[PDB]
Amino acid sequence: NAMNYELMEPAKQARFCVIWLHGADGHDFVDIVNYFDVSLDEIRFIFPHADIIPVTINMGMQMRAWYDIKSLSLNRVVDVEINSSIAKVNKLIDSQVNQIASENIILAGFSQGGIIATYTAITSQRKLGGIMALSTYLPAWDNFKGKITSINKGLPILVCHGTDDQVLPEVLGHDLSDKLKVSGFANEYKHYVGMQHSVCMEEIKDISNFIAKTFKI
């Protein structure tokens, strides 16, 4: 149960919550808060430390696959036993509930972390608030496809991805978005031309607008 995390308590009473996950790609998004145009009067921010994201995931992925990978027998070296990390998030969610309504918590993820936000919410036994997949592919889709919960089929999902990403190519973001679409989870797919493996300013605006349009503030 050991974990560290940065916690931002809102100015007014906490009514909402955003769990922001990060893994090379373990960028410090703690500052991201000052980049938004939405009222953070009632929004608690949870930034778990990168230990919540095991290293053993993107290793096989970005050690075996071709430099110009396009699709996913690579399944042999991806640590599905993810799960633990998911549970961690679950605990965190279970911790915010018994403190904030589960449908008022949003799971956002970037790159390595973006995996543990989607998979969690779509297997979450309870009603969550949203998913913000950013520059993230959908690994071990075979292992997690059956464990999906229809309880969140239709929750606000935002997928974002860079066009010139050579670390995590765009067709994999299309892969996540599409594999969520046919799964029963509709989502906005927003790709950014020129952008690589990062987060830009237009994207920050769109993220802000997502939190605004989901927390209905």
Q: How far apart are CA 129 and CA 152, in angstroms?
A: 9
Active-site annotation, residues: 111, 165, 197
Within a 13 Å sphere around the CA of 103, how many CA atoms are in the beta-carbon half?
Answer: 7
Q: HSE (CB half, 13 Å, CA atoms) of 42?
A: 12
Residue pair 135/114 in contact (Cβ under 8 Å)? The answer is yes
Contact (CB, 8 A) for 172 and 62: no
Show the 3-state SS of the chain. CCCCEEEECCCCCCCEEEEEEECCCCCCHHHHHHHCCCCCCCEEEEEECHHHCCCCCHHHHHHHCCCCCCCCCHHHHCCCCCHHHHHHHHHHHHHHHHCCCHHHEEEEEECCCCHHHHHHHCCCCCCCCEEEEECCCCCCHHHHCCCCCHHHCCCCEEEEEECCCCCCCHHHHHHHHHHHHCCCCCEEEEEECCCCCCCCHHHHHHHHHHHHHHCCC
Please give the structure tokens belonging to residue 208: 């802000």
In the numeric block, the tokens 């029963």 are attached to: 184
**Half-sphere exposure (CA, 13 Å, Cβ side) for 9?**
3
Domain that holds residue 73: 1-217
Radius of gyration of the chain (CA): 16
Q: Please, what is the Cα angle at 177 between 52 and 55, to 5 degrees?
A: 25
Nearest to 214 by CA among 131, 136, 140: 131
Residue 145 phi, psi dihedral angles, 5° rounding: -70, -30
Is residue 52 a contact partner of residue 115, using CB atoms and an 8 Å limit?
no
Question: Shortest CA distance to 135 belongs to which of 75, 199, 209, 52?
Answer: 199
Domain count, the chain: 1
Residue tagged 């605004």 (tokens): 212
Q: What is the CATH number of the domain that holds 136?
A: 3.40.50.1820
Residue 45 half-sphere exposure, CB side, CA atoms within 13 Å?
Answer: 19
Q: Burial of 190 by CB count in 10 Å (0-12 exposed, 13-18 middle, 19+ buried)?
A: middle
Q: How was this structure determined?
A: X-ray
CA distance 93 to 87: 9
- CB-based burial, 85-118: b 16+ in 10 Å, e otherwise: bbebbeebbeebeeebebebbbbbbbbbbbbbbb
